[PDB]
Design a protein around this ligand. Structure first.
Ligand SMILES: [Mg+2]
Ligand SMILES: [Mg+2]
Ligand SMILES: [Mg+2]
Ligand SMILES: [Mg+2]
Ligand SMILES: [Mg+2]
Ligand SMILES: [Mg+2]
Ligand SMILES: [Mg+2]
Lengths: 99, 107, 114, 127, 100, 79
RNA sequence: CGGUCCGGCCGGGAACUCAAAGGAGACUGCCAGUGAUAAACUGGAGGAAGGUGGGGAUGACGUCAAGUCAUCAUGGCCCUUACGACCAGGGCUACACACGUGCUACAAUGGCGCAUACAAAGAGAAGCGACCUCGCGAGAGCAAGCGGACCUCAUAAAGUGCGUCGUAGUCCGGAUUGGAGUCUGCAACUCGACUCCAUGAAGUCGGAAUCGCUAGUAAUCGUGGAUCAGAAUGCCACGGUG
């Protein structure tokens, strides 16, 4: 079999902290991982008015960056599964598991 | 221009003939950034000037250029293209060929 | 060459010359030449009389003449004599199908005068 | 022996694969005349191989994605110059003099707020 | 907007999942079935007796905190004014002024 | 304009057609359905079409079948 | 490199392109001239980039009774079987005119027909919706894939190759109108979008006046998104040529 973990977060310096904790735990317990791959960041762009009345020209420019990380684990070792499944990770990281 | 005194950009020359002056000539006729259709008219016009209106294509353009004389060459090439559009012939290659024929014989 | 459409077509290509008849555009002229068997780039020269009257037979299915002028007109007469809202728009020279009348109604209203 | 050089433009990206000896040009499994519809685009890739003589002397195997007519052609022109500096390493003084090794970084200016284009402003009234 | 106008919008949504969620969904399919009842389905006449305010076209997406019907965003459910005020005080995660 | 699968008519006006044919013609019928399609079973009747503030009676004619009742009620006064 | 059903499609390869986490790199650093030996300027080399490299964010004290009683602060009183509230229809889209702002044009640097090449950036689950089939078409039916670098919108358009029209109110331009339809939605009359047929206004380059812009800019070409059941010649972005 094969399990993969899709990791998404809003901060780039915070998404790699939770990513490195998974990979280092996996290499220590004897699992085969083909590294973390950087998937392209789906960044939205928001341009809305700053004023509730006239002077249309002044606006605000927002964005929301959503980075993506994928870790592929080859062998479903029971020592690998039991450690990684209940790790204490950052609150701003959403996890997606494919068993 | 009051304080910012700078030069003028040096574009790449004509890929067919290696002429620096002919590269500025096709940019005048070029509208809407259509380089492929602008140089097709100019190449077809000069072959009319070369084969049936006098050999030495590079020298035949210069005799037509000399009578209507950086800026002196620029105003000369602009007067050829703008007067070629308001003619009675059918296509732009045929109109500009007759303008270089008239400018070579200074009329 | 005089068709049932008595007005004489110009001596040019076939798909252009059939457009001069009131009620035959470019698409319908393609449909007549495809049903007859005549190429679209054929002029009135060499278009023999055996090839003209077979165009009269194909155009005979459609009413394209002053008879078509009255049927467009009497269809508007059905609206105006009925007293409907759409009948009132044609009588006063006003647009029908929802165009604005603040400005830019110069086609319906006719030329300007203060 | 392979000799590689990366050249790119606004949204293009071209690779260059050099093999010693032919006059062969294969771009995206197509020919030089077949892929390039513009005659100017055929000649701008001949411009770096003008000071350095190529007739039937080296293969070039190129692919490119993105961009357009001259965006792909400018990507090839930069990629060849890095391949010849990989090939001989003494040809640089002729290539610095031509001006082809400099990457044209003139990207598109962003569409600004309050304007319909990058510099084009909507029409203005005096009073 | 006014408090009475937002009370209309809650009244439309409460009828939307009530009536037109599953019942009008069936009646739209019966009019759409090409296989059977090509002439006498009569689902359209039964749709007429249903109340109007269940319609998804009649509802207006408005700001959940103020009620402004203009400048709505489906990303946050708010008007363009309230997007700025939550972003500057750090109430929306990751939302900040951009430059490109 | 409308699709061919069913010409639209309101349910309240359709009931007013049924009683008018059987029980004979009456006083002109007040309604607000400016969007209904005229059916051939209404020819002869007089239906007062609402136009914003009043009701204008419309004597139904044979060639009115297929059109709307809103096409017989001007909504604004012009001078 | 093996494998050919000629598709990265399948073994594989980790090179390269791309994807993004970090770092290096441009600092007048070096050389020459000028300049009071100063700051600086000029010229040249090196370098991907050289004199704030390109762009953005970033906008002082003050001027505009500019914007917000509707972010709130300070509100106080009026109306209160009504200035409130519910529903139907109409209006916000009218029409003798005037003003500002846009699009398409007046064409052979073009129109039309066939063949055909190259984008970037986004959106998608009450959603994007392929394939197949039907219709000239707008679409409809059947029905996968996909919460997505996988699948879908989605064939980018200018351009290129040939043919045609031959300088005219035209195969220019498409307004307006009639007839017949599609789709959305309780519901397309007032007042929707789109398609098909037919009609083919004014207009042949625009007075005084007036605007944008110093380079990937102007000009032009299409694409995507927000708003949105549906309804973009507006607006926000993205690239192509230049
Ligand atoms: Mg005709
Ligand atoms: Mg709505
Ligand atoms: Mg004031
Ligand atoms: Mg004030
Ligand atoms: Mg309030
Ligand atoms: Mg036309
Ligand atoms: Mg400037």
């Amino acid at each position: 079999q094969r399990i993969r973990i899709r990791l998404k977060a809003f901060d780039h310096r915070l998404i790699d902290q939770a990513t490195a904790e998974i990979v280092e735990t996996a290499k220590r317990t004897g699992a085969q991982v083909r590294g973390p791959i950087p998937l392209p960041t789906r960044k939205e762009r928001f341009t809305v008015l700053i004023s509730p009345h006239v002077n249309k020209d002044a606006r605000d420019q927002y964005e929301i960056r959503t980075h993506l990380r994928l870790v592929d684990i080859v062998e479903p070792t029971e020592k690998t599964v039991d450690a990684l499944m209940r790790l204490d990770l950052a609150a701003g990281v959403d996890v997606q598991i494919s068993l | 221009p009051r304080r910012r005194v700078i030069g003028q950009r040096k574009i790449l020359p004509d890929p067919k003939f290696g002429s620096e002056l002919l590269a500025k000539f096709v940019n005048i006729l070029m509208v809407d950034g259509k380089k492929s259709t602008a140089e097709s008219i100019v190449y077809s016009a000069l072959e009319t000037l070369a084969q049936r209106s006098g050999k030495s294509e590079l020298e035949a353009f210069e005799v037509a250029l000399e009578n209507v004389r950086v800026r002196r060459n620029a105003l000369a090439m602009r007067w050829i293209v703008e007067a070629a559009r308001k003619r009675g012939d059918k296509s732009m290659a045929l109109r500009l060929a007759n303008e270089l024929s008239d400018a070579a014989e200074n009329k | 060459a005089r068709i049932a459409g008595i007005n004489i077509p110009d001596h040019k290509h076939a798909v252009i010359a059939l457009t001069s008849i009131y009620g035959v555009g470019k698409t319908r002229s393609k449909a007549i030449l495809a049903a007859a068997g005549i190429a679209e780039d054929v002029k009135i020269s060499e278009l023999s009389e055996g090839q003209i009257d077979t165009l009269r037979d194909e155009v005979a299915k459609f009413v394209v003449e002053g008879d078509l002028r009255r049927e467009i007109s009497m269809s508007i007469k059905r609206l105006m004599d009925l007293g409907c809202y759409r009948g009132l728009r044609h009588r006063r020279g006003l647009p029908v199908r929802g165009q604005r009348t603040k400005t830019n109604a110069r086609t319906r209203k006719g030329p300007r005068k203060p | 022996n392979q000799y590689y050089g990366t050249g790119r433009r606004k949204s293009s990206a071209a690779r260059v694969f050099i093999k010693p000896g032919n006059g062969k040009i294969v771009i995206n499994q197509r020919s030089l005349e077949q892929y390039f519809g513009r005659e100017t685009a055929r000649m701008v890739v001949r411009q770096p191989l003008e000071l350095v003589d190529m007739v039937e002397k080296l293969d070039l195997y190129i692919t490119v994605k993105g961009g357009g007519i001259s965006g792909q052609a400018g990507a090839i022109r930069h990629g060849i110059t890095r391949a010849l500096m990989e090939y001989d390493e003494s040809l640089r003084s002729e290539l610095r003099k031509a001006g082809f090794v400099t990457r044209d970084a003139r990207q598109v200016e962003r569409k600004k707020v309050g304007l319909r284009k990058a510099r084009r402003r909507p029409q203005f009234s005096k009073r | 907007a006014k408090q009475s106008m937002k009370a209309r919008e809650v009244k439309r949504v409460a009828l939307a999942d009530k009536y037109f969620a599953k019942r009008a969904e069936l009646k739209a399919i019966i009019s759409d079935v090409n296989a059977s009842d090509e002439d006498r389905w009569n689902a359209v006449l039964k749709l007429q007796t249903l109340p109007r305010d269940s319609s998804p076209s009649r509802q207006r997406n408005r700001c959940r905190q103020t009620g402004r019907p203009h400048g709505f965003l489906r990303k946050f459910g708010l008007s363009r004014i309230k997007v700025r005020e939550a972003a500057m005080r750090g109430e929306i995660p990751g939302l900040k002024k951009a430059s490109w | 304009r409308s699709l061919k699968k069913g010409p639209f008519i309101d349910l309240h006006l359709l009931k007013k057609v049924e009683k008018a044919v059987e029980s004979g013609d009456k006083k002109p019928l007040r309604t607000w359905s400016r969007r209904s399609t005229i059916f051939p079973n209404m020819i002869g009747l007089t239906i007062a079409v609402h136009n914003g503030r009043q009701h204008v009676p419309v004597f139904v004619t044979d060639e009115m079948v297929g059109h709307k009742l809103g096409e017989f009620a001007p909504t604004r006064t012009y001078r």
